[PDB]
Design a protein around this nucleic acid. Structure first.
Ligand code: DST
Ligand code: MG
Ligand code: MG
Ligand code: MG
Ligand code: MG
Ligand code: MG
Ligand code: MG
Ligand code: MG
Ligand code: MG
Length: 306
RNA sequence: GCCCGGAUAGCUCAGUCGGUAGAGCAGGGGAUUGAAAAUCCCCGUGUCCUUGGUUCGAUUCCGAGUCCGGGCAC
């Protein structure tokens, strides 16, 4: 029953700022919960904390992967669980910060044990999609696993592929394996979420931030990655907001102004979904991004003196 | 100044053989089990620029005006 804290929220909501200020009055250790902040070489477009901030409040799970190697909610849970052990062992409290809700979820509720990605069976699945389309595959999932087929739309290639893969590797069906639940988070968690008071203020912060990045050398950053010649748009790292658009720009597929428009929109759409996650998330205490930055107090009281 | 194209949803544009119109994108909402900053599902009434003409009826054809891209001329 050790204690732990979750500081969630959408992009540009001031989560990072709040976390280090918290480090000041609480015996907490910061753990990053961000699918993009894991990449080495992706610092400005991901809004990664700078070296000074990191000096004040160290973050675990940052720069732990090369943009060419995919991560997963499963890998995060493992790494996260291990980092928490180490932290609580030191008599301090784990403060998980980020905007990647699926990771928070996988960590909190666990994950049904399932086979990991198998590049070979995926390549085959992709192959059959090009020849017969994803419909042929969805009709096949329909035969072996109807429960999953009803949930997964025939237009959802990632989930469709995933449901077939599990079956092709184990022979066991996805709905059958998911009947076994994953290990819940053996911690007492206090979940907070911070966001601006209105959707429009969020949009302004998003657009403004995107320009601060361009002005901080974002383009050059993405070019360094473009120059490696080994990264492609089917990699989680390149599909990240901002990066994907900038990649289209370096490929000469779109103009600069077009890239800036799409990156901003892409970031707003991301925020929209993040808010969808938080809405209905159980046990969430809401805090305000805007000036009520002194929301640390609401944290101080909910978690109480430790 | 003259000629040729545009002018229709927040933006880019389709369309209406004359019977008041629809895609994409933007935006909104919802899903979410080893790619998740990903992948996918649902939501489209707008003085069809203005004004005359013809017409039962015009955003739609014709005339003129206005604004916007070009071209010719100085
Ligand atoms: C989505 C983009 C472009 C950057 C990541 S932003 P973030 O989640 O770090 O936002 P805050 O930490 O809340 O400022
Ligand atoms: Mg941050
Ligand atoms: Mg227009
Ligand atoms: Mg037209
Ligand atoms: Mg008709
Ligand atoms: Mg309509
Ligand atoms: Mg949209
Ligand atoms: Mg008329
Ligand atoms: Mg007319």
């Amino acid at each position: 029953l050790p204690k732990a804290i979750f500081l969630m929220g959408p992009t540009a909501s001031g989560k990072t700022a709040l976390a280090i200020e918290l480090r000041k009055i609480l015996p907490v250790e910061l753990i990053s919960v961000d699918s993009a902040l894991i990449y080495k070489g992706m610092d400005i477009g991901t809004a990664k904390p700078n070296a000074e901030e990191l000096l004040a409040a160290p973050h675990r799970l940052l720069d732990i992967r090369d943009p060419s190697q995919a991560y997963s909610a499963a890998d995060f849970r493992r790494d996260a669980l291990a980092e928490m052990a180490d932290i609580t062992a030191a008599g301090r409290i784990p403060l998980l910060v980020g905007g990647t809700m699926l990771y928070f979820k996988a960590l909190l509720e666990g994950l049904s044990p399932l086979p990991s990605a198998d590049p070979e069976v995926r390549a085959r699945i992709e192959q059959q999609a090009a020849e017969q389309g994803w419909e042929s595959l969805h009709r096949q999932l329909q035969e072996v696993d109807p429960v999953a087929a009803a949930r997964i739309h025939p237009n959802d290639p990632q989930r469709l592929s995933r449901a077939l893969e599990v079956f092709f590797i184990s022979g066991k069906t996805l709905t059958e394996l998911t009947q076994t639940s994953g290990d819940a988070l053996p911690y007492q968690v206090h979940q907070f979420a911070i966001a601006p008071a209105s959707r429009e203020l969020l949009h302004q912060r998003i657009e403004q931030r995107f320009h601060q990045m361009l002005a901080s050398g974002f383009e050059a950053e993405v070019r360094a990655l473009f120059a490696r010649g080994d990264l492609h748009t089917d990699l989680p790292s390149i599909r990240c907001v901002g990066y994907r658009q900038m990649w289209s720009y370096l490929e000469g597929e779109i103009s600069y102004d077009e890239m800036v428009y799409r990156g901003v929109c892409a970031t707003r759409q991301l925020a929209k979904r993040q808010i969808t996650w938080l809405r209905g998330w159980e046990g969430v205490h809401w805090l305000d991004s805007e000036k009520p930055e002194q929301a640390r107090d609401e944290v101080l009281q909910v978690v109480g003196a430790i």
